[PDB]
Each structure stands twice: as C-alpha cells, then as structure tokens.
C-alpha cells in the first residue's frame, strides 16, 4: 500500500503535509527529519540526500 510508506526516521507517516516520498531511493521522510525543513513538500520534483550521495 502506498499509504503504508511512513517517514523512515519516525514511522508515523501521519504528517500528510510534511511526509515527502523520495522517488530516487529514500521511501518516506519528513521535511524536518531530513535537512533544514523545506518550505513545503515539493510537487513531486525532489530527491533525498541518499540518492545525491550516489553522484
């Protein structure tokens, strides 16, 4: 289930507004559980630091 995806760091995945799913690699994360909280959840065009480390 896609909803099953929860912030890997927390696991509550209840913050609908802050839970961002990384398509590159990371599964689910919160804007605050990542790096300095982002202004908002990107419109589907973003990646987490784990995928960036690849490059």
């Amino acid at each position: 289930a896609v909803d099953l995806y929860v912030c890997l760091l927390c696991g509550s995945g209840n913050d609908e507004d802050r839970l961002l799913l990384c398509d590159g690699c990371d599964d689910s994360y919160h804007t605050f559980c990542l790096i300095p909280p982002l202004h908002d959840v990107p419109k589907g065009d973003w990646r987490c630091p784990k995928c960036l480390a690849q490059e």
Binding site: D15, E16, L19, L21
Partner: peptide
C-alpha cells in the same frame, strides 16, 4: 516529492 499520510481508527 509526493505527499504521504497515515492514520489509524479505533
């Protein structure tokens, strides 16, 4: 990024 939500009923 895609938004995801999670809630439980009880």
């Amino acid at each position: 990024a895609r938004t995801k939500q999670t809630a439980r009923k009880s």
